[PDB]
UniProtKB/Swiss-Prot annotation:
PANTHER family: PHOSPHOLIPASE-RELATED
Entry-linked Pfam families: Hydrolase_4 (PF12146)
Subunit structure: Homodimer.
EC number: 3.1.1.1
Catalytic residue positions: S89, D188, H218
Family classification: Belongs to the lipase/esterase LIP3/BchO family.
Stated name of the protein: Carboxylesterase
InterPro entries named in the record: AB_hydrolase_fold, Esterase_lipase, Hydrolase_4, MAG_DAG_Lipase
GO molecular function term, any single one: carboxylesterase activity
Amino acid sequence: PPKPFFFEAGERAVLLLHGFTGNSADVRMLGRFLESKGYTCHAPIYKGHGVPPEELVHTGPDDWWQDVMNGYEFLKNKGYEKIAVAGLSLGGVFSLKLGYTVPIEGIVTMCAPMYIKSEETMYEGVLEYAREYKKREGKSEEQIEQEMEKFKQTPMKTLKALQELIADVRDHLDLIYAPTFVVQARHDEMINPDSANIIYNEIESPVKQIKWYEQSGHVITLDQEKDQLHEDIYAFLESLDW
């Protein structure tokens, strides 16, 4: 079972936020890299994540946002005065939201969506995540088929609220002034990659960058360009005033 992590290293702190159906392991290699460069990092786990998929469908963005805000306060309460945030997929949407809610030193958004899909299609992605989870538990083909039949007997009501969240943060991009680095996979199989241009062009931040990765998929932290990604994020964070 994944756990949140807290990697102590230096005075600069980074909150690391995972994606929908993800967990802290999606940002753990980035956390260890930043820790080796002097950055303290903390990654929460959202409610219903890092646990059986059956639990995910009774949670929604109102819950996950509380984990995000508690993760920010965690850092504050441990003595960190300045905090940057980096987020993957839905985590990048929450990074932006935190950026117009509380004091933030810098924002890194990685493959954050600014367009949505149908609720059916989003539930299809939850079903596929549940299948992979159960495959990974080492369940039999027959056992997985029985459990998935039953999983289907329960709607995930909060998918509309997740659509509303993305739309809402998009509409508030003009409130963002913190230095921001927009990261996007050119060929992203899960979201519209033009999302990155929406973020870059609509924030008000005088210090902004965007970088495209040509050989990566959506979960960019775990893909083949992660080492260059690490160095690019480090370079961005070292450029801030702190």
